[PDB]
Amino acid sequence: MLGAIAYTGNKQSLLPELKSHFPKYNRFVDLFCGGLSVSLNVNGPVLANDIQEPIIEMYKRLINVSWDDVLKVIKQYKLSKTSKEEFLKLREDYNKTRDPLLLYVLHFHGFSNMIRINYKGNFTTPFGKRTINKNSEKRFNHFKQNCDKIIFSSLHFKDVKILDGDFVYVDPPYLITVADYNKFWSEDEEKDLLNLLDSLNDRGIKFGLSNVLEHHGKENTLLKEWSKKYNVKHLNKKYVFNIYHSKEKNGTDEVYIFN
Amino acid sequence: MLGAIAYTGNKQSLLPELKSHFPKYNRFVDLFCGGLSVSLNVNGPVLANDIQEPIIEMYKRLINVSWDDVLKVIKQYKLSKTSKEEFLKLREDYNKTRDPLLLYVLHFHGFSNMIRINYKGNFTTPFGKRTINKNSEKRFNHFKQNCDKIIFSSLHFKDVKILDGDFVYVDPPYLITVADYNKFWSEDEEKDLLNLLDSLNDRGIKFGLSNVLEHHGKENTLLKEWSKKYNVKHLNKKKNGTDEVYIFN
DNA sequence: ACCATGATCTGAC
DNA sequence: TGTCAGATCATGG
Numbered sequence: 001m002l003g004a005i006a007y008t009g010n011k012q013s014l015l016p017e018l019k020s021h022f023p024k025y026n027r028f029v030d031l032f033c034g035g036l037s038v039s040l041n042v043n044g045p046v047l048a049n050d051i052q053e054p055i056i057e058m059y060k061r062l063i064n065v066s067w068d069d070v071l072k073v074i075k076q077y078k079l080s081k082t083s084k085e086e087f088l089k090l091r092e093d094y095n096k097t098r099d100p101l102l103l104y105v106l107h108f109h110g111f112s113n114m115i116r117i118n119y120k121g122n123f124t125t126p127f128g129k130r131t132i133n134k135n136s137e138k139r140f141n142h143f144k145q146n147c148d149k150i151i152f153s154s155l156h157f158k159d160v161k162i163l164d165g166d167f168v169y170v171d172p173p174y175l176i177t178v179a180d181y182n183k184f185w186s187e188d189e190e191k192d193l194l195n196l197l198d199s200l201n202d203r204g205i206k207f208g209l210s211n212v213l214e215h216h217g218k219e220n221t222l223l224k225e226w227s228k229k230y231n232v233k234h235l236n237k238k239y240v241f242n243i244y245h246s247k248e249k250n251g252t253d254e255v256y257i258f259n
Numbered sequence: 260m261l262g263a264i265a266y267t268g269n270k271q272s273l274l275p276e277l278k279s280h281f282p283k284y285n286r287f288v289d290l291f292c293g294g295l296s297v298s299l300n301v302n303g304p305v306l307a308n309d310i311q312e313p314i315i316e317m318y319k320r321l322i323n324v325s326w327d328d329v330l331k332v333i334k335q336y337k338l339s340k341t342s343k344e345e346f347l348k349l350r351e352d353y354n355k356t357r358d359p360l361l362l363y364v365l366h367f368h369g370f371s372n373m374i375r376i377n378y379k380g381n382f383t384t385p386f387g388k389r390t391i392n393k394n395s396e397k398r399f400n401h402f403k404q405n406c407d408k409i410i411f412s413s414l415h416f417k418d419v420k421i422l423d424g425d426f427v428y429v430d431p432p433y434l435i436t437v438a439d440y441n442k443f444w445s446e447d448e449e450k451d452l453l454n455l456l457d458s459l460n461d462r463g464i465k466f467g468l469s470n471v472l473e474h475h476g477k478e479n480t481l482l483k484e485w486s487k488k489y490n491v492k493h494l495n496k497k498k499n500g501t502d503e504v505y506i507f508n
Numbered sequence: 509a510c511c512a513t514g515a516t517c518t519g520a521c
Numbered sequence: 522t523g524t525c526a527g528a529t530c531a532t533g534g
């Protein structure tokens with residue numbers, strides 16, 4: 001299922017499986033929305049939250065722009081797969097003005113359609129010899145067709161108010177796998193997240209957590225044990241199969257921990 | 260439309276457009292059949308010819324081969340997308356025995372399925388970290404379902420005996436482009452091809468020449484001029500600066 | 509490509 | 522026999 005934008009570690013492929021395990025609810029809370037592949041494909045009302053505010057402001061702005069408004073900007077900066085000079089100009093403009101729409105047009109031309117913003121709030125992703133494709137507005141239309149049920153916010157996960165009747169889906173960065181957004185993570189942040197879930201559990205709040213217990217040779221010991229306190233499902237078909245025809249130093253172990 | 264095997268310069272994309280120009284005929288002569296994307300997909304009877312004997316013999320052998328036979332050889336050698344040493348072993352066996360079935364199985368494991376025969380007849384394509392796949396099956400099934408109307412030939416084009424009522428389709432190596440089989444072409448070879456087509460005309464025989472008049476700056480001009488004599492269609496669509504043409508009488 | 513994913517193919521660079 | 526974005530086709534949320 002499509003997400004609003006390309007995004008490292010998205011759940012487009014896993015969404016269908018994850019939904020099957022989702023409970024019934026009065027309000028859905030996507031604590032770490034990211035590219036929204038989760039928020040866009042569940043029943044509302046939805047609360048999509050993410051720490052990276054510049055990205056949330058882009059979503060808030062997308063709600064009121066047409067594809068034409070987007071093509072108008074691409075035509076204005078004369079952007080193409082070979083327009084490095086113009087890509088740099090557009091990047092400079094966004095870094096100064098912080099026009100949310102200019103950021104959306106930027107990602108379409110950056111390296112791997114990735115959005116890398118430093119602490120100063122500026123876009124550092126290099127040109128990617130890319131541009132919109134005959135399927136770029138497919139995501140855009142998916143977003144427009146499902147944004148009406150969503151309420152965005154850009155707060156640190158700790159500051160989000162969870163209420164009775166809500167279901168909390170958590171998909172934080174993963175220490176064991178590389179990802180630009182790892183910069184916002186540390187062991188400390190994870191402990192607070194883990195502490196936070198237990199609370200919702202003791203408050204009659206159902207939640208769901210995505211993560212990886214193992215990868216390439218490392219492991220998240222602390223989480224491995226913590227998870228034994230709930231219901232666990234191993235989503236990576238390859239890791240599951242090789243447990244029986246294994247050698248040892250193999251791949252990733254994707255899971256969905258839900259109370 | 261698929262050919263019998265992947266092949267650089269195949270006409271799988273152009274065949275539909277080309278056929279709308281082909282006449283009726285008593286016999287279709289595919290002078291430079293290559294991967295057979297044309298031969299397997301036109302009404303027969305057909306005469307499929309190519310100068311590369313190894314490939315033609317592979318086709319001749321293929322007629323008497325079942326997919327399970329292909330799989331038996333793959334098990335026997337234990338090939339896979341990571342079996343580089345077993346690939347080298349199969350290649351060595353083919354090079355010594357020259358058995359066509361081994362070539363067929365071997366080409367599925369080489370880079371882009373390319374069949375590169377060197378100066379002494381040995382297969383030298385590098386391992387391609389790949390093996391058979393659904394396309395392999397599809398092409399094989401397509402060959403078996405359409406090989407009945409074809410008679411194969413492995414001769415230099417000037418040696419093939421063309422008859423009355425024949426339609427001679429020719430898709431030779433293009434001077435302007437790059438292909439491994441260009442080592443068989445040259446200005447002189449092309450000169451004689453154009454002379455033969457003229458003879459076919461003098462005899463009242465229909466032919467169709469696929470080719471390139473312009474590609475990457477370079478241009479073929481005796482062909483441009485020689486073209487003025489007959490009908491020409493430009494198929495350059497969607498690929499850039501190239502000017503794919505079809506010259507027929 | 510079609511609903512969407514993903515394996516594979518192919519034409520620029 | 523490199524890289525890879527976009528296209529093609531098989532099939533499974």
Ligand SMILES: Nc1ncnc2c1ncn2[C@@H]1O[C@H](CSCC[C@H](N)C(=O)O)[C@@H](O)[C@H]1O
Pocket residue numbers: 003007008009010011012031032033034035036037038049050051052155156157158171172173181184185
């Ligand atoms: N303290 C924090 N609070 C909320 N979100 C945080 C955070 N630290 C990092 N993140 C967010 O963690 C997200 C992990 S990616 C989650 C991906 C998402 N489910 C999808 O399908 O695309 C990033 O978007 C990052 O901005």
Ligand SMILES: Nc1ncnc2c1ncn2[C@@H]1O[C@H](CSCC[C@H](N)C(=O)O)[C@@H](O)[C@H]1O
Pocket residue numbers: 262266267268269270271290291292293294295296297308309310311414415416417430431432440443444
């Ligand atoms: N002198 C010659 N006589 C016959 N065939 C020749 C030749 N010199 C080169 N060739 C053959 O020219 C072919 C050009 S490729 C033609 C491709 C074919 N229509 C397809 O759809 O696959 C090659 O297969 C090459 O072996």
